[PDB]
Amino acid sequence: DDRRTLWTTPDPSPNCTIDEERDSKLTLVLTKCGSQILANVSLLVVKGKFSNINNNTNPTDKKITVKLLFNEKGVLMDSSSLKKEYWNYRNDNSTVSQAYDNAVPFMPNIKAYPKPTTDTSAKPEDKKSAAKRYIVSNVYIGGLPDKTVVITIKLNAETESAYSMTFEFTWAKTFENLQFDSSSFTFSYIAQEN
Amino acid sequence: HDDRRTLWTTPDPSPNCTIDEERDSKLTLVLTKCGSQILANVSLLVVKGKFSNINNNTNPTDKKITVKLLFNEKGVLMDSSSLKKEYWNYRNDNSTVSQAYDNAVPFMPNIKAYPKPTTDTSAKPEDKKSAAKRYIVSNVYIGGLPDKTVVITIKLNAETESAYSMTFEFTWAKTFENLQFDSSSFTFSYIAQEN
Amino acid sequence: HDDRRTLWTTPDPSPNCTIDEERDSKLTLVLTKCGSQILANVSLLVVKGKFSNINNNTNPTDKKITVKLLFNEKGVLMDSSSLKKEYWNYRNDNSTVSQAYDNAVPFMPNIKAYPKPTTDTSAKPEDKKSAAKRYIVSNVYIGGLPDKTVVITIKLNAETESAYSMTFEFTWAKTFENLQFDSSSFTFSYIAQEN
C-alpha cells in the first residue's frame, strides 16, 4: 500500500474513452517526489477511429484529447476521459482496496497553475503566464522516429473542475492505417499540498 | 512547514530575473532533491523590456535569452546571477524560509559529473573530457503554441567566475512578431553534489 | 555511507562500455528510485575507435550506436551487456559500494508495464499489447550543439536473452564530419518492478 504513487495500473484494462466507451488504455503513473510530481504517460487506442488512423479517408482525424478533471479533494470526476475504478494509489501492481478520498498532494499547484481568469489588463507586465501550465514535446507512434506526434499537457485549464490535467496528441503527417500507440513520455509539475 | 528537499523561486514569483533591464522577467525554477539527482522544472515569463515583445522584423538579432545562476562553494546564489536572491530559497509552504540559506551544496551540479572547464588540450585524446554531458538541450514552446519552437540549452558548471553554475539559453530561428517570451515548462535532472 | 536508492556507473566513469572495440566509450547512467518510478539520466562519450571520430563522408553507413544493458531475474548486469560490471553498483559517495550487488529488482523495468515481447499469433485485436509503451524516443545533441541532432531510442525489456533489459540506440540522418560522439544528457523515467 503506497500513497506516494497515484496510477492507472501499469497494465490497465481499457480505461479511457476518446471516441467510443473504453476504446483506449491510458497508462498514467504520478509519483510524488516532494514539491514535484514525476509523471509518466503512454496511450494505446484498442478500438474505434484511433485504433486505425487513416488521414487519406479521414483527413480531420489528427487530434486525441484525454481529460482528467479533479474536484477539490483531487478525486477524478465522472466527466474525465479516464474511468475511476483503477485510478488509485498503488498496492503492488494494482490499486488499494477502496476508492481514495484525497489526492490533493498530487494535484497541479494552484499558485503555479491558477485556474484561468479573463483578466482585463493589456499591460504585458500584468500578464499571467499562458505557457507555464503547458508541457509540449514529441512522442512517436510505435516508437518509430518518423511517426511524430506533438504531446500537449495542460494543468488546471479546465473550467468545470478544481484541478485538471489534459493530454492532447496531434500530428501533421498523413498517417495510413496506423494504430495510435504513443512512446512513453516523462514530465514533472509543481505539486499542491494540503 | 519548512522543506530542505525543495530549493525554488516561489511557484508564483514577482519579477526576479534580469535579461535586458533589471527584473524584466519571472523565472519559475523548482529544484527537488531525489537523492543523487535533482529534478528541475523551469519556465520563464518576460514581463517588460525587449523580450516582453520580441519582433524579429524590427530586431532580427533578438533570437537569444541567457539566464545565468552562479553559485559559490556553499551553493549560495552570487549577485552577478540573472536570478535575484530575495525569494531564491528552501520551500516554506508556497513561499521561502524566513532567512537566506547559508548552504545548498546538495542541490549543486555534481563537480565530478560536470567539472569546471579547464584550459587543457594536452590530454591523451582518450582522456578527453565530455563537452556535452553538462548540457541538456530540448525544445520549449512560447505560449505552449506548437509552431513557436524555442531551443532550451541548459549548461552546468560551465561559468568560470563561480564554484557551480546553471545557465538557461533560449534560442529560436523563426521570425517572431510582437511575441511575449513565455516558455512552456521544461523538466530535466542532473547528478547532485553532496556536502 | 552507502545508498541503495541510487544504482549508477559512477558520475565520472573510466571507459566502461564496448560499442565497437573493448571499453571504447564512457556511459554515464544514473538510476534513482522515486518509489514506483526510476528517474534515469544518461550520457555517452566515445573515447576511441570509429565513433570517437565519426566521418559519414568516408563511412556513410556509420549512423547508429547501440548500448545494451541485459539483467537476470535478480537485476544483475549480464556479461553480454555493453556496460562493464566493475563500477555498475549502488552509490557510495561518488563511487560504488565495496561489494557487487546481489539484487536490483526494484530498479528493473516493470514486467507488467513492459512485458517481454511474445510471438503470439493469438490476437483478439483489442487485446493487442502496446508496441510503443516500452519506448522512450527523443533527441540529444552531440557537443550540445543544436545542429548535431541525434535520435535516442530507449527500449525496456525487449531483449529476448534476459529477464530485463534497457537499450540505448543513438541514430542520426545528417553527415557528421570528424565528430566525437558525445551526447547531451537525457532524463527519462520508467515504471519500477518490485521484489
Author numbering:
A (entry chain B): 184 to 377
B (entry chain C), C (entry chain A): 183 to 377
Question: What is the paper's account of this structure, in its own sentences?
Answer:
The adenovirus fiber knob protein is known to have a highly conserved trimeric structure. Sialic acid (SA) usage has been proposed as a cell infection mechanism for EKC causing HAdV-D. Here we highlight an important role for SA engagement by many HAdV-D. We provide apo state crystal structures of 7 previously undetermined HAdV-D fiber-knob proteins, and structures of HAdV-D25, D29, D30 and D53 fiber-knob proteins in complex with SA. Our findings demonstrate a conserved binding site for sialic acid, common across the species D adenoviruses, therefore suggesting that, along with CAR, the receptor can be used to initiate cell entry.
We performed X-ray crystallography to generate structures of species D human adenovirus fiber knob proteins HAdV-D15, D24, D29, D30, D32 and D53 in their apo states. HAdV-D15, D24 and D32 were crystallised in only their apo states, whereas HAdV-D25, D29, D30 and D53 crystals were also soaked with sialic acid. Additionally, crystals of HAdV-D32 fiber knob protein soaked with sialic acid could not be obtained. CAR binding was investigated for fiber knob proteins of HAdV-D24, D26 and D32, and was found to be significantly weaker interacting. The respective IC50 values were quantified as 0.02931, 0.001261 and 0.01996 µg/10e5 cells.
